[PDB]
């Protein structure tokens, strides 16, 4: 189907090669950064991002999909810089990120009005730019599938139909929000194969993850490093298993790393003694080497990091 | 010099002239305007802002307090273009406007680290400018007093103590959220006379109102025009009753008009019927004349619109 890149003539589905499916160059709360720019440092952030991408490309990473959308502080101009300064393939997406309600702006507005916003970022461009969204991100968490949360999921379903672009979800692995995102998206006509249920690696309940995969969707083991949601040695033990059961065709791995996080749980103070080894290369340093160590083979890891992302964007 | 102004030198608590205590030059959602700027037209917004501000001046309005803060789309620089085009005593403020929870950025952070933000705008400047904040605005609505909501309130108190600036609040006149904000600010040291429970004019329940006034806190009859919450005539009737009971010295009147409201509930087409007369000079055309006509002398009004504000910023 061909995919739009941040500041590039665009590439074809089959030519994305080794790609990381959930990585944030930078995340912040639009509101806070707009009212207190003194808290942030573009230069310090820009560099932290450059070091990651380049040294992530050194490992062979050819494409990076960044699910940073509204609520996370998407910035197409910042992302465009990183591209010019690295040459990496960035796939920017659209959508909305919320756990409970929508900004007051969305009061008594139709799901169609929302989908329009997504379709705009896909057809027209992003933030007055020519860069187009190659997907749509949606979220759900502890609060569950709330009213406004469901409205976004449906707005996503429409955008998919109208554009054919895939969907990436943030979910809570413990409250079945992921399975619900799948139920709704499927009921609305979305192709399960065009759905990636995220943050499923945050659990070791193999029986639940399989239920989502058996329905034909991708299961997102996409938080290597964040030891707060699940230790690495226990995540690897989980991924290594779904692989033994032949679920590679639905397995997607990433870090969900944020070269720069304004989160109170990501301060330049906590990380050290919370999620130490949490880099955009944690998989090459541990995961992958571990898998090969358990006799997986290059074919399988090629499936997870090349074939899957390929089927996903086509 | 003790009360900050946008694009002007500070002034004394006095010579503030006829003032509108609660008016918005324009409101919007930080997140939405960033991600989808195609939804807004600054050219138009600017013309309307300057437009209204002028007519206000034509009626003797010398000062306007704009309680637009985080969540409502505060833009100091935009306010400058309005002041320079009118030369109005526009007072800017700091604070956070939420109904339920804070942006993930505040997750973990303490009520103390939040107060530090307001103080920056009060001492240093708003969004990296010499423009100081003359007050703090907190909010609470239908959802009630949530954890995050309460955190913001207590933070507001801290700021008042070290800065001396008053607090303008937003509440729901139907769920005691206003009284709560009152029983939570005074305790933190804040001087009751330095508070202003707003949106009390949205109800005809005289008992509920008098209760807040009977505690040294200013009552906010500040939504003239917004018939959705209460018709003009029924408001005029309510304010008159309060005056006829000596609650004059504690009464503050305004429109809470959004020369450019982002809410989807105030669409361009659904204007008439919902808030036809709604403007920033609706009180000079209706309210005031009504009052005079009903035994309220010129001194009282000068008390409500001139002195009361003074006491507020002292
Ligand atoms: Co997520
Ligand atoms: Co209000
Ligand atoms: Fe993420
Ligand atoms: Fe207001």
Residue numbers in the entry:
A (entry chain A), B (entry chain B): 1 to 314
What does the publication say?
PLLs are natural lactonases endowed with promiscuous phosphotriesterase activity. The catalytic center contained two metal cations coordinated by four histidines, an aspartic acid and a carboxylated lysine residue. A structural analysis of SsoPox, a hyperthermostable counterpart of the PLL family from Sulfolobus solfataricus, has revealed that loop 7 is shorter in SsoPox than in PTEs; linking the active site to the loop 8, which forms a hydrophobic channel that accommodates AHLs aliphatic chain. Indeed, W263 is located at the start of loop 8, involved in the dimer interface of the enzyme and positions the lactone cycle of the substrate onto the bi-metallic catalytic center.
Compared to wild-type SsoPox, variants W263L, W263M and W263F are the most efficient at improving specific activities, ranging from 30-50 and 20-35-fold at 1 mM and 100 µM, respectively. These variants constitute the Phosphotriesterase Selected Variants group (PteSV). Variant W263F is the most proficient (kcat/KM = 1.21 (±0.26)x104 M-1s-1), followed by W263M and W263L with increased efficiencies of 23.3, 14.1 and 4.6-fold, respectively, as compared to wild-type enzyme. Noteworthy, subtle changes, such as W263L or W263I, yield to a large tradeoff in catalytic activities. Regarding the PteSV group, while these variants exhibit higher phosphotriesterase activity, they demonstrate mild improvements for the oxo-lactones and no or wild-type-like AHLase activity (W263L-M and W263F, respectively). Indeed, all variants exhibit a lower Tm compared to the wild-type enzyme (between 92.0 ± 2.1 °C for SsoPox-W263L to 84.1 ± 1.6 °C for SsoPox-W263V). Consequently, substitutions of W263 affect the relative orientation of both monomers; for each mutant, the monomers are closer to each other compared to the wild-type enzyme (with the exception of W263L). The analysis of the normalized B-factors of the variants clearly reveal that the substitution W263 is destabilizing (as confirmed by the Tm of the variants), but also that the active site loops of PteSV are significantly more disordered than those of LacSV. PteSV lose their activity before the loss of the global structure (Tm), whereas LacSV do not, and exhibit a similar thermophilicity profile to that of the wild-type enzyme. These data strongly suggest that the increased disorder in loop 8 caused by the PteSV substitutions collapses the loop as the temperature increase, whereas it does not occur with the LacSV.
